[PDB]
Amino acid sequence: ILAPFDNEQSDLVHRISGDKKLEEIPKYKDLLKLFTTMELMRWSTLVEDYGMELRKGSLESPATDVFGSTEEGEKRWKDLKNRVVEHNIRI
Amino acid sequence: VPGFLQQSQNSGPGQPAVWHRLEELYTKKLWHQLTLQVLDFVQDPCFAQGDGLIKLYENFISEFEHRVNPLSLVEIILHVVRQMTDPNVALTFLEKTREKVKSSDEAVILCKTAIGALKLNIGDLQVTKETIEDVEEMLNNLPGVTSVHSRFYDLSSKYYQTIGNHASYYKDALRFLGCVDIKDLPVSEQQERAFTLGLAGLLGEGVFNFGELLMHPVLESLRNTDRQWLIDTLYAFNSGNVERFQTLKTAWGQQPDLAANEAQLLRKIQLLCLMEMTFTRPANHRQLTFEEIAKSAKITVNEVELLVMKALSVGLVKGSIDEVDKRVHMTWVQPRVLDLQQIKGMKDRLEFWCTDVKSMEMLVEHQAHDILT
């Protein structure tokens, strides 16, 4: 979500995708949308889908990696909007 | 044993006479009469559990007969399960006997089909689903028995029971049609199976092929017993597209499955409508107004400006689309089957154009006969 599209990024996302342990996590299902062309994913829909990412209340252990707060979180928040916007233009 | 067959074995009418005949076969050593005629009496279900309990005693007689396992063992097992009733460990015993005595490797794959079905009854989507995968390996590429492939279909249908995957059901039902001997299948039992195929089996999103399976003759005739309007609604989603009158009818045709997947099916018919314009009409009528697509997607014309994009997004078929009137005039499309008798394929489009070309080819010859030399 925070990393720009690249030939390396695509090969890596496929390798991480399909892990049995990853399959159990609900967030992995949400992350699959970027991995597939999936046509276009609207950012507003993603905010509703990723409200859990901000505070899961069950996991949220790597949520610091995304929107932890401001310096490492708001910068990540802008990146997600940019990467999905980049996804919209690519498709 | 000879005394047991003469009097105690007899249960149904004519059983003493048939068992006396079985004793004559036992002395005559005619395994073929035991393999077919004796098992034919076993095939009759009136005796039910009682023939099956006798069948365990007869199984010892069958071991002496040493009849071919692919024919003899499978028939014995078919009524052995009836004797077993609920087989908590009875299943292990019948599987153990099948594994210990194998006339041929094909019989061993038949043993696997039985093991999977018994495991399916006690457990769901566990070792039994893996055994269904094992049976695919055991079957390999041999369809000569054909009935063995039907047993393979039975576990494939069981896989449909284990996970909804209606697409897997669509594949297995088609496999059954190929591996069934003919319409020798009990017509009423198959019509009852087709009643389910007409209802939940085709109501499942797994099968919607514009009549590739729906217009196949054997199942549709059996599905005639199932509500005709529901059967028509299934054709209507695929080729009638929106079919708003049929959409009201589909709720009437089958409330189960349709209600659960109504939103998903509505999306599928909208995709079907987009494929329909290009394959059914090539150019000219293929181009159509946005309002017709709005009716085709059963959505408002203002909404269809947003909706056509979503239908276009699926991009099942690569094409060229103009939003001046939302006209299609697109490129590649794959029709599941051609409409009617392929009237377009006749002089309506093809053939007639080809006749025109050869006359023009003659014009090239007339234009330059000397040059041809």
Swiss-Prot record, chain A:
Similarity-based family: Belongs to the proteasome subunit p55 family.
Disease cited in the entry: Stankiewicz-Isidor syndrome: A neurodevelopmental disorder characterized by delayed psychomotor development, intellectual disability, behavioral disorders, mild dysmorphism, ophthalmologic anomalies, feeding difficulties, deafness, and variable congenital malformations of the cardiac and/or urogenital systems.
Function description: Component of the 26S proteasome, a multiprotein complex involved in the ATP-dependent degradation of ubiquitinated proteins. This complex plays a key role in the maintenance of protein homeostasis by removing misfolded or damaged proteins, which could impair cellular functions, and by removing proteins whose functions are no longer required. Therefore, the proteasome participates in numerous cellular processes, including cell cycle progression, apoptosis, or DNA damage repair.
Description of how the protein assembles with itself and partners: Component of the 19S proteasome regulatory particle complex. The 26S proteasome consists of a 20S core particle (CP) and two 19S regulatory subunits (RP). The regulatory particle is made of a lid composed of 9 subunits including PSMD12, a base containing 6 ATPases and few additional components. Interacts with ERCC6.
Protein name: 26S proteasome non-ATPase regulatory subunit 12
Record lineage: Eukaryota, Metazoa, Chordata, Craniata, Vertebrata
Gene field: PSMD12
Included stretch of the parent chain: 275 to 365 of 456
Curated annotation (Swiss-Prot), chain B:
Domain PCI, chain residue ranges per copy: 168-335
InterPro entries assigned: PCI_dom (IPR000717), PSD13_N (IPR054179), PSMD13 (IPR035298), WH_DNA-bd_sf (IPR036390)
Residues annotated with N6-acetyllysine modification: 295
Gene Ontology CC annotations of this record: cytosol; extracellular region; ficolin-1-rich granule lumen; membrane; nucleoplasm; nucleus; proteasome accessory complex; proteasome complex
Database matches in Pfam families: PCI (PF01399), PSD13_N (PF22037)
Sample GO molecular function, one term: structural molecule activity
Biological processes, Gene Ontology terms: meiosis I; proteasome-mediated ubiquitin-dependent protein catabolic process; ubiquitin-dependent protein catabolic process
Keyword terms, alphabetized: Acetylation, Proteasome
PANTHER family given in the database record: 26S PROTEASOME NON-ATPASE REGULATORY SUBUNIT 13
Protein task: Component of the 26S proteasome, a multiprotein complex involved in the ATP-dependent degradation of ubiquitinated proteins. This complex plays a key role in the maintenance of protein homeostasis by removing misfolded or damaged proteins, which could impair cellular functions, and by removing proteins whose functions are no longer required. Therefore, the proteasome participates in numerous cellular processes, including cell cycle progression, apoptosis, or DNA damage repair.
Family indicated by similarity: Belongs to the proteasome subunit S11 family.
Oligomeric form and interacting partners: Component of the 19S proteasome regulatory particle complex. The 26S proteasome consists of a 20S core particle (CP) and two 19S regulatory subunits (RP). The regulatory particle is made of a lid composed of 9 subunits including PSMD13, a base containing 6 ATPases and few additional components.
Name used for this protein in its record: 26S proteasome non-ATPase regulatory subunit 13
Species name: Homo sapiens
Organism phylogeny: Eukaryota, Metazoa, Chordata, Craniata, Vertebrata
